[PDB]
């Protein structure tokens, strides 16, 4: 039951290990601008 679909219906299984933090939105925009540079940021969640 670990599967989920898309809006295009192309379903696939993926890790549900996702969380909810409190961040500025400008952080998300900066991460996009960093993807445009080929640079990834790894944010480590304190509780795992």
């Amino acid at each position: 039951s670990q599967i989920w679909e898309d809006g295009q219906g192309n379903k696939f299984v993926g890790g549900n290990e996702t969380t909810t933090v409190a961040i500025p939105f400008v952080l998300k925009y900066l991460d996009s601008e960093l993807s445009a540079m080929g640079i990834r940021l790894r944010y480590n969640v304190e509780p795992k």
Binding site: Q8, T20, V21, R42, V45
Partner: protein, 64 residues
Amino acid sequence: MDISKPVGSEITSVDFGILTAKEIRNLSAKQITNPTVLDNLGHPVSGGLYDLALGAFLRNLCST
């Protein structure tokens, strides 16, 4: 900020890396092919820069 919406997780640290071309296509939602931002009828084309894949544009549900 609402003080009745507690957050459990925190960003304890961050690290800088490179986004390899393999994982980009792994994490991608759609490839962009044709430079058709908005055709006639004032709408985006399928598979274009302003695709419905890359988000919900105007009064259109996001295709992803």
